Design brief:
CATH topology of chain F: Aldehyde Oxidoreductase, domain 3
CATH class of chain F: Alpha Beta
Helix content of chain E: 10-25%
Number of strands of chain F: 7
Bound molecules: magnesium ion, zinc ion
Strand content of chain E: 25-35%
Family (chain A): Belongs to the bacterial ribosomal protein bL27 family.
Largest interface: D-E, 35 and 33 residues
Number of helices of chain E: 2
Protein name (chain A): Large ribosomal subunit protein bL27c
Distance between the termini of chain E: 71 Å
Number of domains of chain F: 1
Structural class of chain E: alpha+beta
Shape of chain E: rod-shaped
Largest sheet of chain F: 4 strands, antiparallel
Subcellular location (chain A): Plastid, Chloroplast
Order of helices and strands of chain F: EEHEEEEHE
Chains: A mainly beta, B alpha+beta, C mainly beta, D alpha+beta, E alpha+beta, F alpha+beta
GO biological process, one term (chain B): translation
Oligomer: part of a larger assembly
Radius of gyration of chain E: 22 Å
Distance between the termini of chain F: 31 Å
Organism (chain A): Spinacia oleracea (Spinach)
RNA sequence: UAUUCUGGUGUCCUAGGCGUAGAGGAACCACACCAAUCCAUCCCGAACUUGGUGGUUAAACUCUACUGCGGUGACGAUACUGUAGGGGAGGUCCUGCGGAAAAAUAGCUCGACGCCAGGAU
RNA sequence: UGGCCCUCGAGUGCAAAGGCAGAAGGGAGCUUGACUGCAAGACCCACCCGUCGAGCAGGGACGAAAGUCGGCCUUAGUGA
């Protein structure tokens, strides 16, 4: 009949990208369903929020054959120029 | 949908293997039971390595106990023992039990209990 | 209406002002469907005072 | 006009021997030879016989359900299972979980025994009988026959029966074709066409 | 078989036919008293002859008159 | 008059018309054809009229394929209606055609009768067009 | 120390799948058969369970092979576009410098790599 | 009720979207973590609110154990 009701955009989507840095607890992705799957060193929440358990570079991977999963790997910073 | 018993047990083994995971401090205790033979392994998944493996195909239990058709409860207990000693000598105490698709019962159950009385923790 | 707020209360709690370290009457609260299940709900739940899981019944 | 039930009536006999031992002794060599199989295990075997009562008006009155359960029991020596309807159906006045039919599965030795009390006992005692249709196979080698009323079996006592209740019987065989399955049944004494 | 829920299956069932025939079968009862079983039923031969031979109007005419 | 039998939402976007249509380019049915030169919006009434004209002028010649069809809805607000309080009522239906697109295919005549018939067809079209022969 | 084979067990991945043809029974894996005190079926020793037999590669799995299906997939070109302009009444067109598909065909594909036990050389 | 072929097209209390096949879908057994005390760090952000949570202690539930459990596949169901 008469339209015009709607919703504020929920702020979902990738918060930290591939090869950026994460704190422990830092939220990597807010999603509705699971458009990503938890990998290693990485926990998943009730709303399927994915968060880091470890400081380090976050890397996305083929879950296989089709889907995707995210996991966090510890990096090494020696190379100070 | 696989109604071949084989494929079915593989299904259950994978389902169980979802939850239980071999780590350096808590290796996976892996039971395989075939018709003429009982085979058991111990795995660290992170390093992708088996530390100790005991089976009815080894001369120890071969010269100890012989059986007619299927592996007996007795066979099982002898194996649980063998692997308990084998692992306690490499410094592995605390491990996780992979029932490898089979219902925990019968010679699986007895396998477990034999490994427990002998100083293996699970 | 047909779905109601119910108070659970520890049965073994004595309102007399007990002599222990922490004194108080545990109550939880929750909802029941008064039609579906007319039986007075009983639930085993934790009590901060008794320190053990006790049985919490209801109040009218 | 060809009689393979002159095999079934042949001499004073025993049960186990009849079905299972005439299978191992006689049937298996016969089939092994006439279809020329390159291994023994390719022989057609009888897997299972499920007997299925279809009564949906029995959901209304549970006593008919209990009665027919007892009937199918005394017939098959096995206390039946009561099958629940999966979906809510309008025109049949059915909702989910409502008890519709009555089903038993017969396996192992009871399979052979009930099969025997079928061909050699109730089938001839039936109402006017010509032969069971050769055309009732499913193409993959499993056969089905209806029984319009259950007074067929003597375990069923006809004066004590309140109402006539129908049965369906489904024979399941490892056979992949109907020829092999048909030879299997007939060789075992079945009255075809 | 699960115990006590099933009706008792007596493995020995003597089939007694009134032609004094005694065979063995299986069933809940010990003895079955039978009339008209597989062997000793019209089906094989007698019924074939009755269904297939019952026509013949011309000879039926000639038997009356001739 | 051509038109879709059902859609969920009544009202639709004007859209935007760009490029070439590479797909409808070929002539796969008949012999001679009418090709759309320019980016436009064909009402079902125009296709109707063009087809009727080509059909009547051909007559004794056999066959006319209509290679297009008006599946996108179009909406209008009434007269003396102040702007606001909702999108209007769909009146008619259009087909979106881009340059290179084939409209009419025709078979069963000499090239002369076909050139003339296709001309009378292109007279009821909103757009510039072309005459082409099968390969 | 090698190699080869069986069974277990995993990680990587281009997700190695279906089909057709062939090989495997000494060992291993499997089914087959038999009997039901541990446990077992909303009915059924079918499954799952304990204990026997010694049958068979039929099913299963395993291994070699093949493009028929399936899966994968360019180069180039074009569509589109970033920025600098131009034409058209407009719908929209065109140029220079930079990026660059989808589709389709050419090809590619019948997985790779590791530990353990157990034979063989 | 029996069987063969397609393989995710059903389902998920209710809209729609995103998820989810040996599963988040269907069933069975035992249960009350639909707990107390908290909490590094994040996301969202005018403010007020709102969301995710590794981890610690107490006292438990299921489980042989490993472990999982601070309501519900997620997002509405509310009011300073
Ligand atoms: Mg939104
Ligand atoms: Mg949680
Ligand atoms: Mg065995
Ligand atoms: Mg007939
Ligand atoms: Mg251009
Ligand atoms: Mg297109
Ligand atoms: Mg014009
Ligand atoms: Mg590939
Ligand atoms: Mg490849
Ligand atoms: Mg084979
Ligand atoms: Mg190909
Ligand atoms: Mg292809
Ligand atoms: Mg290129
Ligand atoms: Mg440009
Ligand atoms: Mg410009
Ligand atoms: Mg360019
Ligand atoms: Mg370039
Ligand atoms: Mg590309
Ligand atoms: Mg491509
Ligand atoms: Mg290879
Ligand atoms: Mg819905
Ligand atoms: Mg959906
Ligand atoms: Mg579930
Ligand atoms: Mg913890
Ligand atoms: Mg926690
Ligand atoms: Mg705790
Ligand atoms: Mg306990
Ligand atoms: Mg749930
Ligand atoms: Zn208390």
């Amino acid at each position: 009949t008469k339209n015009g009701r709607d919703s504020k955009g929920q702020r979902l989507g990738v918060k930290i990208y591939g090869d950026q840095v994460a704190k422990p607890g830092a939220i990597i992705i807010r999603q509705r369903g699971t458009k990503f799957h938890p990998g290693k060193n990485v926990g998943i929440g009730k709303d399927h929020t994915i968060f880091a358990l470890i400081d380090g570079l976050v890397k996305f991977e083929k879950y296989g054959p089709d889907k995707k999963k995210v996991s966090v790997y510890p990096r090494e910073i020696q190379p100070e120029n | 949908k696989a109604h071949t018993r084989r494929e079915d047990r593989t299904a259950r083994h994978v389902r169980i293997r979802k939850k239980v995971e071999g780590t350096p401090e808590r290796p996976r205790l892996c039971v395989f039971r075939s018709n003429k033979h009982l085979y058991v392994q111990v795995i660290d998944d992170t390093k992708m390595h088996t530390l100790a493996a005991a089976s009815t195909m080894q001369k120890a239990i071969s010269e100890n106990i012989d059986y007619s058709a299927g592996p007996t409860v007795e066979v099982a207990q002898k194996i649980g023992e063998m692997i308990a000693k084998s692992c306690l000598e490499k410094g592995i105490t605390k491990v996780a039990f992979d029932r490898g698709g089979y219902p925990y019962h019968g010679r699986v159950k007895a396998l477990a209990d034999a490994a427990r009385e002998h100083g293996l923790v699970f | 209406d047909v779905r109601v707020k119910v108070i659970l209360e520890c049965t073994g709690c004595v309102r007399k002002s007990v002599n222990k370290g922490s004194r108080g009457v545990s109550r939880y609260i929750t909802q029941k469907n008064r039609h579906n299940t007319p039986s007075r709900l009983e639930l085993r739940k934790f009590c901060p005072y008794c320190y053990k899981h006790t049985i919490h019944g209801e109040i009218k | 006009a060809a009689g393979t039930a002159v095999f079934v009536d042949k001499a004073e006999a025993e049960t186990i021997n009849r079905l299972k031992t005439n299978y191992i002794e006689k049937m298996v060599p016969l089939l092994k030879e006439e279809f020329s199989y390159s291994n023994i295990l390719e022989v057609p075997k009888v897997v299972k016989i499920v007997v299925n009562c279809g009564i949906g008006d029995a959901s209304q009155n549970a006593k008919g359900l209990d009665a027919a359960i007892n009937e199918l029991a005394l017939i098959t020596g096995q206390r039946p299972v009561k099958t629940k309807a999966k979906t809510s159906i309008a025109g049949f006045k059915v909702r989910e979980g409502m008890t519709l039919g009555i089903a038993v599965t017969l396996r192992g030795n009871l399979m052979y025994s009930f099969l025997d009390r079928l061909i050699n006992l109730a089938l001839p005692r039936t109402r006017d009988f010509q032969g069971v249709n050769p055309n009732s196979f499913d193409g993959h080698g499993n056969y089905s026959v209806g029984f319009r009323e259950q007074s067929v079996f003597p375990e069923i006592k006809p004066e004590i029966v309140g109402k006539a209740r129908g049965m369906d019987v489904c024979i399941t065989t490892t056979a992949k074709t109907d020829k092999e399955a048909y030879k299997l049944l007939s060789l075992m004494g079945m009255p075809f066409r | 078989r699960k115990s006590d829920i099933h009706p008792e299956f007596r493995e020995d069932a003597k089939v007694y036919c009134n032609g004094e025939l005694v065979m063995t079968t299986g069933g809940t009862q010990k003895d079955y008293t039978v009339e008209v079983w597989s062997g000793n039923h019209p089906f094989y031969l007698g019924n074939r002859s009755a269904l297939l031979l019952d026509a013949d109007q011309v000879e039926k005419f000639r038997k009356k008159y001739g | 008059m051509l038109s879709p039998k059902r859609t969920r939402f009544r009202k639709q976007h004007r859209g935007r018309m760009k490029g070439i249509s590479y797909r409808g380019n070929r002539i796969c049915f008949g012999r001679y054809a009418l090709q759309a030169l320019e980016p436009a919006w064909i009402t079902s009434r125009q296709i109707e009229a063009g087809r009727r004209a080509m059909t009547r002028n051909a007559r004794r010649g056999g066959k006319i394929w209509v290679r297009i069809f008006p599946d996108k809805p179009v909406t209008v607000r009434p007269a003396e209606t102040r702007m606001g309080s909702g999108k209007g009522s769909p009146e008619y239906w259009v087909a979106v055609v881009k340059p290179g697109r084939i409209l009419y295919e025709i078979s069963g005549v000499a090239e002369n009768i076909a050139r003339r018939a296709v001309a009378i067809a292109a007279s009821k079209m909103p757009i510039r067009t072309q005459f082409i022969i099968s390969g």
